[PDB]
Each structure stands twice: as structure tokens, then as C-alpha cells.
Amino acid sequence: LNRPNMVSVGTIVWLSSELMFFAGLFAMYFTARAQAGGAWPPEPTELNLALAVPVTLVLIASSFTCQMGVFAAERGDVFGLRRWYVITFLMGLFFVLGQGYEYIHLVEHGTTIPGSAYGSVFYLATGFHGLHVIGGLVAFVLLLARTKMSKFTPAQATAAIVVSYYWHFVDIVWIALFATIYFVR
Amino acid sequence: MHIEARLFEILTAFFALAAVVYAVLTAMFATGGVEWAGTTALVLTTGLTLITGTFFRFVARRLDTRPEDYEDAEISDGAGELGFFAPHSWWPILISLSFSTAAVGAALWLPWLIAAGVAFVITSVCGLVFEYYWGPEKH
Amino acid sequence: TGVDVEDVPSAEWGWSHMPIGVMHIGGLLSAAFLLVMMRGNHVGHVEDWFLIGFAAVIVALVGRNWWLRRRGWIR
Amino acid sequence: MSTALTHGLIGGVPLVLFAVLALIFLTRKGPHPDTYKMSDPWTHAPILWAAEEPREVVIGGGASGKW
Amino acid sequence: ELDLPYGSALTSSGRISAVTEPGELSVHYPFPTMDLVVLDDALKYGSRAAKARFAVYIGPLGADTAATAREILANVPTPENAVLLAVSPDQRAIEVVYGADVKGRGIESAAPLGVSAAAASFKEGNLIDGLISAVRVMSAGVSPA
Amino acid sequence: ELEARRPFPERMGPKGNLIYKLITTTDHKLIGIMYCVVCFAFFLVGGLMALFMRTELAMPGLQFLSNEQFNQLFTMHGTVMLLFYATPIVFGFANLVLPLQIGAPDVAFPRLNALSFWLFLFGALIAIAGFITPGGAADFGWTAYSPLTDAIHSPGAGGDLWIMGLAVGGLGTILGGVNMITTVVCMRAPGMTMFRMPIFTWNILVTSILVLIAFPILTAALFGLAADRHLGAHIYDPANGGVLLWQHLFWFFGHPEVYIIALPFFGIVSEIFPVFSRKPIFGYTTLIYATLAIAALSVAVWAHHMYATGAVLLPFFSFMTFLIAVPTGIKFFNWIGTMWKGQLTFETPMLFSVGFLITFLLGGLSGVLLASPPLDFHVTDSYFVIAHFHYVLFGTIVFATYAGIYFWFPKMTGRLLDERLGKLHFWLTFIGFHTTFLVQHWLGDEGMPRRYADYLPTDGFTTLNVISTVGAFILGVSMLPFVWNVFKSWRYGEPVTVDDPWGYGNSLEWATSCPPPRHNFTELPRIRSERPAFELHYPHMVERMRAEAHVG
Ligand code: HEA
Ligand code: HEA
Ligand SMILES: [Cu+2]
Ligand SMILES: [Cu+2]
């Protein structure tokens, strides 16, 4: 029975809704850029492309690690699943820490949320994505803990798969945000 | 799953047409140029429909006909064993109470209440996720 | 004492019955207290509405229960 | 203007309309059948009513009467 | 009508699936609702206290009335523990029949009392009132055993 | 021989039968009942707010209210009526009758179902708990426009609670939509194809897609507004395009919303008409295609709420709205062609459906008139708009909801509502509504804008306000027969020992017991058309049904 997977359908449609949420955020950002004429990144702001690219590379690497974990999960092997998902969790935590460090260095040199119109849209566009990353990390921890406490079944496999493409959605959203904020300007 | 994919593909086509038409017609003939809000909204609505329709198309392209997708199917064709459907549970109301606590702590700016609500949300979601997987107690 | 096992399954395992006169008199005295709380230094009248409404609801509930038990519709 | 007039209308027209429509409708006849009179013959089908209460053919007695 | 009368149909199981027209009822009892409710309450709370089913029959007994009554009692769910009261308002006959398990529990000194109450109430034309009175007195008579 | 029944069914149920089941239940039928009850309670509180508004609006001058109090009153009335009654009553009806209509035993995610219900309830409570604040509830409009909602203007704590309650409720609604989509996609009987399912199911699927499109962008806008109000975040600053940004976002959410609260009720009346006309539904595929067309077009007209700002491209949105006006007319003609040449009997659901037809027709005429920008230039933000959307909203939501209750009360309880009380209720509601909301067209055409707490005697409009208040009090006294009928008929009332108490029923819900069992079915009939219960209960009609299915 169960020719298509039901948790998969649910996760896909919910990911679509979250795409609409990020649509709202992108609209907020794209407006008020057309109002800043000239040096539209204002008085004190300078983005650090020497630190923005490594964290993106780590995020893509984590996506690849998660896909490898999915491959390990499709065959009834739980230990490879665990290894690859621990690696993915660590890479994601490193991304989050790098983003926080960039936040600190950017806030102690000017740009703040109540300081300018650019700081507000920048911080809201990136912080909600960071929150989604933290949610994905929590999901990873819960999935691993659940694998520890019962026999490995196709339901466990399905859980791994749906968590994986949630992570992939987060990664593609970050790619869009990065391309929009650091290159297009 | 042909009709679901076809529905979402029709929606995608119409949304993409409307998006591109609105984009170019605000690039011209508008008081300030591109509108930059409705354009983004329509583009990412098209993206929503595209994601869902593409997933459904990929599922349908590698699946045998189901008893509910085939007329002249018999009710004894679906005989078997369906999935697992949860009986009674009390975790949803606790999840809702935790989320409401965090929401009240955000409405009235109280970071201690926000943190308590977040911790309660984590705890109750853990309880919901582990409910049918805890083993017997090890004594 | 005892109630029916068809109303309280574990009636033989613990205290399961409380007489209805206690509840009726308690409700009436609660309403009386709510009413008597209109004596003091409470200038303004937005709270008298709450007191009167809460007492009226309780009296109506007690009266409904007493009537339906007197006429046999419950019990 | 006409404070008393507006008050009277606002407070009275809904009640009058309610009463009229209630008289028109609630005085009609319901679909419930008429009560059986013991003078006419029993025309309904036979009825058997049980108690359902005790949850889980040799006769042991009897008694008779003729009103 | 014994062949699924115009709306009823046999299903994949042995269950029937009947219908009704948009303005019609499907019970057709020539008694008030608030009298059927009192009879149901009496018939339930007497059986609960007596630990024995109580049943009521209203149709005809156009034969040996005792034989028909004790052939009717065999339709009660648990006939070996049951007390049935049958009334014919055309032949004007009242008959109470028992079971084996309900015997020596106060059944002999309560059946004539039930018949007497039912008759005394039927001599004015109160069928439901007579039934309720008879059920009350017989239920107060029988004891749980 | 004989068969042993009870003199009367059991009235209520044993002690302790509901309270713990109510906290731990995962049964979609009980969840739908809870939806319905809580939604009607919120309807009552919103109606009380409207009654206060009417009684102040009569008799020029401020008699007992204040300006701030009147503002809070219309804000909270609009908010409660639009988001705490209609949007959750949609999912109440869905949870009631969708798995039965597709032949399923249960919904896809039964714990997510309960989570959606509880999120709705607690979000509504959070949003409404602003009246106990010394500043009062929210006092900007229901639309909460751009610079008025910042922290300098409207600095009270009611707006914060408003925002957070809306966010909680929106998450609940999104989860409900996900559940419904997945249920229709996966759980489905082994003979029911997608072009054999009911129009109510089709409309619910479309409404769920619209929900998934519309609600997340409102959540994003609310989070941006909270960021402003609590951190000084320059996002809706008028030095930017912050004034028009908020309007664009909010109306992109808000028009799909008014289409979210219409299509399930179109589906309800399209399920009700054929049963009481003893005919098939006219143009099954045409109705499906009209629903899809409305769903598609509803996401490109949002700016017809922004004609007077002087910042939108008028012809695009005007053409889109004129276009969206056509599938509704096709749907109306299908509903009429269903009743044409039948055997019509008018019980309470059919009566309420005809009232719906009339009222919605007039409201839609007003709307398509309102869709012209030159005319909107005069009649916008007046009582003409109020009259229009009250006609459409009342006609669809209130009338189709009452029709659905009168229709499906037996299928959920095993009892019948009284019909004389239903006729009294219908006529009270009809007279009251057409007395209170007809003169407002004139009221708004002559200069009288919306959201005014007071006016002057030297103006006109002092008799029409009194007439509208009289009608409003009639509408207020209309609810007592309905409430009394439900309260009595739940416990007493004619029992239903059959399937289909309204004979000639379709849609596979009338082919199971009157109160359905847990998992809803003990047997399923062969599925060949969209009328399986009809083909099951009248087997001699299949030949006559297929022979003449195309004459017209
Ligand atoms: C269920 C709710 C609902 C529904 C169904 C509708 C349906 C429609 N609405 Fe309405 N509308 C609202 C609720 C609704 N509306 C609300 C709540 C507001 C304002 C909220 C706020 O501002 O507070 C609003 C505001 C609103 C405005 C802006 C008014 C203003 O702010 O000034 C406009 C104008 O473009 C409009 C137009 C329409 C049109 C064209 C339809 C069409 O769907 C109607 C089509 C109906 C018909 C019956 C046509 C069918 C066709 C035929 C029958 C053939 C004949 C055709 C012609 C006559 C040419 N609506
Ligand atoms: C579906 C949604 C909905 C519904 C059903 C209603 C129902 C009613 N509305 Fe409302 N209305 C709106 C949605 C709705 N409205 C919206 C969106 C606005 C614009 C919002 C904005 O301005 O911000 C609006 C604005 C609005 C105004 C303009 C206020 C202002 O701008 O000045 C007026 C006044 O004439 C009005 C009147 C009514 C009346 C008389 C009813 C009647 O149908 C209701 C009468 C019903 C009852 C009276 C209930 C019965 C009450 C009791 C019996 C009390 C007993 C109950 C308990 C004890 C708790 N409405
Ligand atoms: Cu609109
Ligand atoms: Cu305006």
C-alpha cells in the first residue's frame, strides 16, 4: 500500500507556503532600495565579501553531506545516517556562528536596526533565515534522538528524507538572498 | 496523479503570464516605474505552484495506476492495510499553550517570557515527536 | 455511601458521592457574598454590574438544577 | 428628531414583528402523529420496547388480567 | 415491502440502507415525546435497580394470549433474565411473563400488582400512564439476585 | 418477527463522557463540532459590538459612547467577524464532511488537525484580550493602514495583542490548509476519481491552495509591523515607499481572503440544490472550471482597493476585475439550470439557499458596479461600500452556513431540527437584513463616509440611520429561535433511524449511518458517477439517468 508518500506531500506544500513568507520579506527589501538614490548602501555600511563567501560554501557542503546521509538512509543503515547528519549539523552550526560574528562586526561599526532604512531590511532579511536554520538544526537533533530509541523502519526513512529537503529549501533560499544582497546590490 | 499535476500546471502558467505582463506594464506607463511589490509576490506565487506541480509530476511519472485513479476499479481492489493514524493525544493543546505564551511575551515586550515560551515550545514539540517511539522503561 | 457504578465506574474504590444540598446551599451563599460585597468605599459603578451578573448566573443555575431534579428530568 | 418616537419604534417594531411571525408559524401543525385514543382500534404495527440496561427461553411464571 | 421498499437496498454486508422523504419522520409512535421519555427513563432505572430487563409489548394477541406472550418474550435480548408486560387494547388483555433466572426474587407478589395498576389506569384511557405505573411497581418489587 | 428498540433514544450521555475526550480527541467530526460552536460564540460577540455601533449611530450626537470607543468597536467587530468566525467555520465544515464525501476513514494528519483548532482558539483569545487594557483594544481600522499603526500614533498595547493573535491564528489556518490538501490528494476511496468527487470537495481544495498563497505574506507583514513598533525599524517609513508597501502587501493578502470565505459556501449550496430539486447538478465540469478560473483570477485584482491613492495602474486591475466577474455569472446560471424543470419542495435548507441566491445577486451587482474607477472615485470609503460587502458577505456566509447546519445536523447528531422554528428564523433574518442594509446605498451616495462616530442634524441622513438601526435590532432578535431550536433539538427532537433523511441525496455521505461510526463506514458502494448514494438507493434509475444525461 501507500504508493505515494503522505508526509512528503505535506512537507512540500508547507515549503511552498514558507516560500511565500520569504516573498513578503523580499518585497519589503526591494522596496526602499528604489528610494535610496546613489550610494544606496548608506554612510557607514560596507559588506565583507571575504567573510560572506566561506559560509555559503560551507552551507552547500552541508547540503551535499545531507544528501549523502539520505543515500545512507534509503538502505537500512542507521549508523551512516547518524554520521552524515552529525556532520551536517556541525556545518550548519558553523554557518550560524559565522553569521553571528558578521552581525557583531557590522553592528559595532555603524549599521543597526534602528539606525537606518538599510540596516532594518538587511537584518530582517537575514535574521529570519538564520531562525529557519536554527529550526533545521533542532529538527536534526530530534531526528537523531528518535533514531536512537527504536528499530529503524520506513517511517524513520521518510522522516530523514523530509528533513533533508527542508534543509535543501533553506539552502536555496540562502543562495537567493546572498546573490541578491552581495552581488546584485 | 495526473489531474493534480495538471491543475497545478494550469495555475503555474496563468500566474507566470500575469507576473510577466504586470512587470512589463509597470516598467512602462507607471508613475515610478516597476512596482517591486506585486511583481515579487506574483513571481514567488508562480514559484510556489511550480514547486508543487513539479513534485507531483515527478511522482506521477514513476507510479502505477492507483485504484482511485482508475474507473472500473472495484472496492475489493483497495482491500488491504492503510497507514498509521494516531488515536488520542494531548500534546497539541500544550504546543498551542506554549506558542501562545511566546506570542504574549512578544506582544508585551518581555524577553524572559519569550525565552520561557520558546523553551516550552521545544519541550512540547519533543513530546509530540517522541510519543509513539519511547520504549518501555528500563527499571 | 454510594452512587451507581453506571455513572461512576470506580465507585467502590473511593469517595464518589457528595450530596446536592451542600452544593445548592453553597451556591446560594456564594451569590449572597457577591451581593454583600457592594458595601464599602467603591465609588464608581462598573463593578456592581459584574457582581450582580455573576450572582444572577449562579442563582439561575441553582434554580434550574433544583427544578429539573424536582420534576424528575434529571436524577 | 422625535426622541421618544425613535425610541418607541426601535424598541417595539422588532417585538411586534416577532410576535406576528411566531403566531403565523408556531401555531401550525407538526409532523408528529396524533396520540392514540383507547376508544378506536389499534391500527399501528406491533411494538416491543426493551431496557438495554443490563449489558453482557425457559419461562418461569406469568399473570393475566382483563382490565 | 418485504423486498426493500423503495429506497432501501442491500449493501456489500447484510446491512440495509433506507431513506425518507424530505419532510417525513421515521418513528411513527402515536404518543407524546415527553411521555415516551418518561417511559424510557422508568424502563431504564427500574431495570438498573432490579438487575433484570423489563420489556413492553402493545400489539395484538389474537390467539391463546399466554402462549403468544411467552412466544414474544423469546425476542428479548436475554430472555432467561427478563420480565415482559404485554397489552392488547382491542381484546383488552394484560399479561406478564417471566424468565427462569428471574424467579424467587419477588416476581410472584409483584406481577398481579402490576396488572392491577395497569388496569386501574387503563379504565380511563391512559395507556402510557398505565404502562409506567406497572413498570414502576414491578421494578420496585423485584430485587437483584 | 419483532425487534427490540428503546421508547426514546438516550438524551445526553453519561457523566464524564465529553470533557477528557474533548481534550485528547483526534476525531475530525468532534473537531468540526467544536469549530462550529466556538465560531458561533464569536459571531454573537461580534454582533453585540455591531448593535452598540448601530444604537450610537442613531440619534445624532454622542449619547453614551466616545470616539475612541466607537473606533475600537468597529475595529474589533470587523476583525472578529472576518477572522474568528468565517475563516474557521470553513474548516469546521471541511472537518465535518470532507472525508465522508471522499470515502476516507480519517484525515491525513489527525494531530495536526487538533493543533490547528487549538491554535485558532488561543490566537483569537489573545487578540480579543485587549479590552482589559487601560488603553483599550485596537482602534485603527481592520485594515490597519500605514503610518497610523506605528508607535507614535496609536501607542497602546491593544495593537500588539491584535498583531500576535493574528499571527497565531494564521499559522493555525496554514496548517489546516496543508492537512486538507494532503487529505484530498492521498486518502480517497478505491473507485472515486477526481472528476467523480463532490463540488464541495473541489471548492475546499481550491480554497486550501488560496490559503497557502495568502496567509504567509500577511504573517510577514505583521512581523515587519511588530519589528517597527518594538525596535524602531524604519520599514514602513513614509520617507521610503512604506505607505504604499503596506497597502500592497495587505491587499494582496486580503482579496484572496474574501475569496477564501466564498467558495466553500458556493459548494454547500451546489450540494443542496440537486437534493431538493430531484435532479442532477447542471454543468458539473463547467462549475469545476469556473471555480478554477475564479481561483486563478483572485490573485491579480488586489489593487482595486487602492483606486483613490493615485498610485496604481487603473486599467490593468479594472480589466482583471471585470474579467473575474464572468465565472460567477456562469456559476449562477448553472445553479438556476439545476432547479429548472424539477419538483421543488422548500424545507429550511432550500429556503436559506434561495435567500442566498437573491442576496448574493444584489451584492454582486453592487460590486461589479463598484469595479469602475471613475465611479469608485465618488462612492469609495462611503456607506455604499459597506452595503455592498455586507450584501455579499451575509448572503454567502450567513445564509449558506445556516443552510449547511440545517442540512447536516442529522448526519452529525442523529436528530432533526424543528422546521417551523427554522421558517420563523429564516423570515426574521431575511426581513431584518433587507431592512438594515438597503438604505445604506443611498446613505453613502449622498455624502456620508464610513467609520464616523457622529454627524450633524443639518446634514441629511437622520431617518435612514434610524431605519437601519431598527433593521439591525430585528437581525439581533433573529438569533433566539435558532439558538432555542438547536438547544432543544440536540437532546429532544425526532430521531433519525435511516440514512438520508432528505431522500434523493448524493455525495456518498448519505450512504452511511445517520451518526457515522468511528472510521465512518462499514461498507462502500460501487462508484460510477458523482451520485453514488443516489445510484445505490434507486437502482432502477441508472438506465434512465444515463440515457438522458445530455438533452438539456
Ligand atoms: C465574500 C465577500 C466578497 C465577495 C464575494 C466580493 C465580490 C466582488 N467584489 Fe468585493 N469587497 C469585499 C467582499 C467581497 N467582495 C469586502 C469585505 C470589501 C472591502 C473591505 C474593506 O475595505 O473593509 C470589498 C471591496 C470591493 C471593492 C473596493 C470598494 C472600495 O474600497 O471602494 C471593489 C471594487 O473593485 C469590489 C468588487 C467586487 C467584484 C467585482 C466582485 C465579484 O466577485 C462579484 C461578481 C458577481 C456578480 C453577480 C457578477 C456575475 C455575472 C453575471 C451575473 C452576469 C452579468 C455581469 C455583469 C452585470 C456585467 N469589492
Ligand atoms: C462576516 C462578517 C460580518 C458580519 C456577519 C457582520 C454583521 C453586521 N454588521 Fe458589520 N462589518 C464587517 C463585517 C461583518 N459584519 C466588516 C468587515 C466591517 C468594516 C470593518 C471596519 O470598519 O474596520 C463592518 C462594518 C459595519 C458597520 C460600519 C461601522 C463603521 O464603519 O462605522 C455597521 C454599521 O452599520 C455594521 C453593522 C452590522 C450589523 C447590523 C450586522 C448583523 O448582521 C449582525 C447582528 C447580529 C447580532 C446582533 C448578534 C446577536 C447578539 C446578541 C443576541 C447578544 C447576545 C450574545 C451574548 C450574550 C454574548 N457592520
Ligand atoms: Cu476586493
Ligand atoms: Cu480608503
Look at residues F355, F335, F229, F252 and name the one whose alpha carbon lies nearest to residue F299.
F252
Give the length of chain A: 185
Kindly state whether residue A69 falls inside one of the protein's structural domains.
yes
User: Which of these, E144, E125, E139, lies nearest to E55 by C-alpha position?
Assistant: E139
Q: How many CB atoms neighbour CB A180 within 10 A? A: 15
Residues with CB under 6 A from ligand 2: F 44-45, 47-48, 50-51, 53-54, 74-75, 77-78, 81-82, 86, 141-142, 386, 393, 397-398, 436, 450-451, 472, 475-476, 479
Q: Which residues of F479-488 are buried (b: 16+ CB within 10 A; e: fewer)?
A: bebbeebbee
CB-count burial class (<10 Å; 0-12, 13-18, 19+) for A94: middle
Which amino acid appears at position F550 of this protein?
A: H
Residue nearest to atom 40 of ligand 2 (CA): F472
F165 touches chain B (CB under 8 A): yes
Distances (CA, A) of F49 to E107, F82, F183: 65, 13, 38
Contact B6, B40 (CB under 8 A): no
Contacts 24+ apart (CB under 8 A), C6-14: C6/D53, C6/E48, C6/F14, C7/F14, C7/F15, C8/F15, C8/F16
Helix (H, G, I), strand (E, B) or coil at F85: helix
| F383 vs F228: CA distance, rounded Å | 32
Residues F91/F179, Cβ–Cβ less than 8 Å = no
List CB contacts of D45: < 8 A, sequence separation 6 or more. E59
State the Cα–Cα distance between residues F195 and F184, nearest whole angstrom: 13
Where do the DSSP E strands lie in F432-488?
none
Q: Domain range spanning residue C28?
A: 1-75
Please tell me which of the candidates A20, A27, A33 has its beta carbon nearest to residue B48. Answer: A20
The verdict on a CB contact (< 8 Å) between D6 and F466 is yes
**Protein residues within 5 Å, CB atom, of ion ligand 3:** F 255
Pairing status of strand E53-57 against strand E93-97: unpaired
CB of F197 closer than 8 Å to CB of F165 = no
Total length of chain F: 552
In three-state secondary structure terms, D49 is strand
Q: Which atom of ligand 1 is nearest to the CA of F317?
A: 35
Q: Are the CB atoms for E61 and E88 separated by under 8 Å?
A: yes
User: Which helix (H) or strand (E) segment is E87 a member of?
Assistant: strand E82-88
Question: Does the distance separating the beta carbons of D26 and F424 come in below 8 Å?
Answer: yes
Closest residue by Cα to residue F398 from F43, F117, F74: F43
Chains F and D touch (3+ CB pairs under 8 A): yes
The H-assigned helical ranges of F298-445 are: 314-339, 348-370, 373-379, 383-393, 400-413, 419-436, 440-445
Nearest to F230 by CA among A120, A103, B101: A120
Q: Which residues of F touch D52 (CB under 8 A)?
A: 6
Q: How many A from CA of B21 to the centre of ligand 4?
A: 27
- Rounded to the nearest 10°, the torsion over CA A115, A118, A123, A129 is 170
CB A66 within 8 A of CB A164: yes
**F372 burial class (0-12, 13-18, 19+ CB within 10 angstroms)?**
middle
User: In chain D, which residues are followed by a C-to-N distance beyond 2.5 Å, i.e. a gap?
Assistant: 56
CB F358 near ligand 1, within 6 Å: no
Measured at the CA of E18, the angle between CA E14 and CA E23, to 5 degrees, comes to 170
Q: Whole domain around residue A16: which residue ranges?
A: 6-183
CB within 8 Å of A87: residues ≥ 6 apart: A62, A65, A69
Chain F residues within 8 A of E25 when measuring between CB atoms: 416, 494
Interface test with B, best of F302, F313, F320, F323 (most B CBs within 10 A): F313
CATH of domain F18-548: 1.20.210.10
Query: Measured between alpha carbons, how far is F137 from F147 in angstroms, rounded to an integer?
Result: 18
What does residue E83 show for φ and ψ, rounded to 5 degrees? -135, 120
Q: What is each CA distance from F21 to E34, F9, F91, in whole angstroms?
A: 30, 22, 20
Give chain E's length.
145
- How does A110-142 read in b/e, with b if 16+ C-beta sit within 10 Å? ebebebbbbbbbbbbbbebbbebbeebbebbeb
Residues after which chain C is broken (C–N above 2.5 A) are: none
Determine contact, residues F235/A28, Cβ cutoff 8 Å: yes
Asked if F494 contacts F413 with a C-beta cutoff of 8 angstroms, the reply is no
Q: Could you give the C-alpha distances from A101 to A49, A94, A183, B75, in angstroms and in order?
A: 14, 11, 21, 62
d(CA D29, CA F418): 12
If DSSP codes are grouped into helix, strand and coil, which group holds residue D23? helix
Cα separation, E71 vs E60, in Å, equals 13
Q: Which of E36, E37, E41, E51 to mutate to test the interface with C (most CBs of C within 10 A)?
A: E41
Q: How far apart are CA F459 and CA F519, in angstroms?
A: 63
Residue written as cell 467609520? F451
Q: What resolution in Å is listed for this PDB structure?
A: 2.7
Grid cell, residue F14, equals 453519561
Contact between chains at F15 and C8 (C-beta distance less than 8 A): yes
Ligand sitting nearest the alpha carbon of F78 = 2
Check: CB of residue B67 under 8 Å from CB of residue F190.
yes
Q: Which ligand is nearest to the CA of F376?
A: 1
- Cβ–Cβ gap B86/F157 under 8 Å: no
Q: Which residue of A has its CA nearest to F112?
A: A10
Residue found under cell 491587499: F251
The helix (run of H) or strand (run of E) holding residue D64 is strand D62-65
Number of domains chain A is built from: 1
Q: Is residue A1 part of a domain?
A: no
Are the C-beta atoms of F496 and F514 separated by less than 8 Å?
A: yes
Domain count, chain C: 1
Query: Under 8 Å CB-to-CB from F342, ≥6 apart: which residues?
Result: F277, F278, F279
Question: If you measure from the C-alpha of residue A24 to the centroid of ligand 2, how many angstroms do you get, rounded to a whole number?
Answer: 31
Q: How many CB atoms lie within 10 A of CB B79?
A: 9
Residue owning grid cell 421543488: F344
**Assigned C-alpha cell, B77:** 481492489
What is the position in ligand 1's atom list of the atom closest to the CA of F368?
A: 40
Residue of A nearest to F236 (CA): A28
Q: Which of residues 86-115 of F touch A (CB under 8 A)?
A: 108-109
DSSP characters for E11-38? -SSS-B-----TT--S---SS-HHHHHH
- Judging contacts by C-beta atoms under 8 Å, the chain A residues touching residue B5 are none
3-state secondary structure of B128: helix
Q: For chains A and F, what is the number of CB pairs under 8 angstroms?
A: 95
Q: Closest Cα to residue F140, out of F166, F165, F125, F158?
A: F158
User: Which residue bears the cell 445505490?
Assistant: F536
